[PDB]
Amino acid sequence: LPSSFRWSSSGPLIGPKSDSRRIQGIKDPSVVYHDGRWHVFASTAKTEGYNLVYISFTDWAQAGSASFYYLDQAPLGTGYRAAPQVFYFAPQRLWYLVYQNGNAAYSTNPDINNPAGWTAPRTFYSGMPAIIRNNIGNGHWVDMWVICDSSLCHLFSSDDNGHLYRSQTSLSNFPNGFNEPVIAMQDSNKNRLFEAANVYRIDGSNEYLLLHEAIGSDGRRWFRSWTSTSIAGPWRALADQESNPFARANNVAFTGNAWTRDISHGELIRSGNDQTLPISPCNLRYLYQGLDPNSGGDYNSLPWKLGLLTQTNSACA
Ligand SMILES: [Ca+2]
Ligand SMILES: [Pb+2]
Secondary structure (H helix, E strand, O other), X not given: OOOOOOEEEOOOOEOOOOOOOOOOEEEEEEEEEEOOEEEEEEEEEEOOEEEEEEEEEOOHHHOOOOOEEEHHHOOOOOOOOEEEEEEEEHHHOEEEEEEEOOOEEEEEEOOOOOHHHOOOOEEOOOOOOHHHHHHOOOOOOEEEEEEEXXXXXXXXXXXXXXXXXEEEEEOOOOOOOOOOOEEEEEOOOHHHOOEEEEEEEEOOXXXXXXXXXXXXXXXXXXXXXXXXXXXXXXXXXXXXXXXXXXXXXXXXXXXOOOOOOOOEEEEEOOOOOEOOXXXXXXXXXXXXXXXXXXXXXXXXXXXXXXXXXXXXXXXXX
């Protein structure tokens, strides 16, 4: 894995359907390739609220025409749900879908191909942990992310106030037993460490990759990156500056026209679908949300669409 990045971006691939839901943004994607298809979970966003959608397609050229399965039709149900993470928890032979509902929440499903099967929400904690209540400011508890190694499971989350939190539990007790979070990383400037963590095992190394969204000096979204030998840190900067970013307008080429100046809440294409959240260090691809740089108005109404970054300074195949 290199210490600087360059990318080529697609155009917008996935946006809202034109249906009575009048969804304004498709956001916060999670993605796995399984049995010959892409499986994308995303937030639906509008002024009125958030819920989740499942999208599947064989080929990236067909992503835009893929049908939506609105997950409020499953037991997962209506109400607020946002920012999903899908993975297969191999010891239980169950897929998990992690998201926020005001708490840190999850659904399960034995079959990712059955969107109707996602369970009604359960939570990882009984309420907002004290350390998060104490430090959240007037932020929001968001962007729940699980990664496990051979003995522990970790649950990361953000507060939109410059703190990244981490709880852990044993692999055998998951999803129960998550302890009081510690502050895994923090910045006194919330914009430098804002939301939307990703944490991955880097295949072929004894290292982990942390990505985290920031709001830059130009007001635009971008990603910083760090690595560590442990999921518990300490984290060392990889590409974490505006002049050496993980992903930002200044290291993203477009084959077509530049349709976004923001590189926001995304996920890397993984090398496997299990609870270890592995990536290959080769040919990185980042499924992300962007929007027209002339967009304004209320945050929840912004016209976010999903695109795909393909690494152009790849170290390998
Ligand atoms: Ca996410
Ligand atoms: Pb946000």
